[PDB]
Amino acid sequence: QELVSLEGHQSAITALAFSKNIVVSGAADGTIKVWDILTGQLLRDHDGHQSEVTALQFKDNIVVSGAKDGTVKVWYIGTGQELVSLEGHQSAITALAFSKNIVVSGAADGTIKVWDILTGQLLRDHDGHQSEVTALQFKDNIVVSGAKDGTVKVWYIG
Amino acid sequence: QELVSLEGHQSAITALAFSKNIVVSGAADGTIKVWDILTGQLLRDHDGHQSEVTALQFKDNIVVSGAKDGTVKVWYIGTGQELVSLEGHQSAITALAFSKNIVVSGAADGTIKVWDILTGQLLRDHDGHQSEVTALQFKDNIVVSGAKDGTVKVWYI
């Protein structure tokens, strides 16, 4: 049944993203791999993160990846090169959402940050839930987030 | 900027889904709540699962929810009533993917199951991975799965 053969990682798969004919996979050792789904070949080994990558988003040749060390990176699928620099969080990334040119990230300390992928500038910043963000949904300038304390919050982004 | 205020759940949020102006939330106690983004009111308390809900998919008025007891449920957003029956998995649901009228579910035993939401029929039933399925991507009849042993597989369906 297997369409192609992928080598996988030397550690647990923690994040997955799929756009056009390219698969991006992240693992608990910080590694990120880019695969061609038409041939099964490994396109490139990304620089990865210094920590387990916890979230991936992949849209229009642009990948956003987050790690347990709080880093959020925005890079070009074709080269793995960083397009822009984000400050990230001082806590592990627990949720990522990517819609239009906006990245929303959630962290274990409850903070939620809104980034512009064009410039990397922090558009919106707050402490959010003050409880680990467990789920993020971002659609049509509306962010819906959930936390470990049971709260569900809705933010308009504009 | 903060649109509405939602009561939330009495336990930790484990899954979120958002379609049109409706939010579906699932919690560690098995409860599933349906919210109206506009008014901010609680639309209904779904029957939920007898286990912690681990995954949520919400698309075209149809919600697919999975739980740690291995149950996958397909129900209508407006009423909460189950439309069809899925026999589910024998271990915990760990990943859900919903594209067109197909649901792909991955479990802690590594099994990957493919369901038709119109009939509830099990379309495909792979052994999948030798470890827990940790990620699923489903697009254009192509399934990409990842597992805790580091494997990544691509399935045509």
Author numbering:
A (entry chain A): 2 to 159
B (entry chain B): 2 to 158
Would you copy out the relevant sentences from the publication that reported this structure?
WD40 proteins are a subfamily of propeller proteins with no intrinsic enzymatic activity, but their stable, modular architecture and versatile surface have allowed evolution to adapt them to many vital roles. By computationally reverse-engineering the duplication, fusion and diversification events in the evolutionary history of a WD40 protein, a perfectly symmetrical homologue called Tako8 was made. A different computational approach was employed to redesign Tako8 to create Ika8, a fourfold-symmetrical protein in which neighbouring blades carry compensating charges. Tako and Ika are the first successfully designed eight-bladed WD40-repeat proteins for which structures have been confirmed crystallographically.
In contrast to Tako, Ika expressed well as a polypeptide with two, four or eight blades. Ika2 and Ika4, carrying two or four blades per subunit, respectively, were found to assemble spontaneously into a complete eight-bladed ring in solution. Ika8 produced two crystal forms in space group P63, with one or three copies in the asymmetric unit. Ika4, however, crystallized in space group P212121. In one crystal form of Ika8 this axis is crystallographic, but in the other (and in the Ika4 crystals) it is noncrystallographic. In all crystal forms, the Ika proteins assemble as trimers which stack on top of each other into pillars. Unlike in the Tako8 protein, the conserved inter­actions stabilizing the crystal assembly involve hydrogen bonds between the outer rims of neighbouring molecules, while the interactions at the top face are mediated by water molecules and are not conserved. In comparison, only the alternating repeats of the Ika proteins can be superposed, in contrast to the template structure where the overlap of the individual blades is much poorer. The melting/denaturation curves show that the Ika proteins are more stable than Tako8, especially under low-salt conditions.
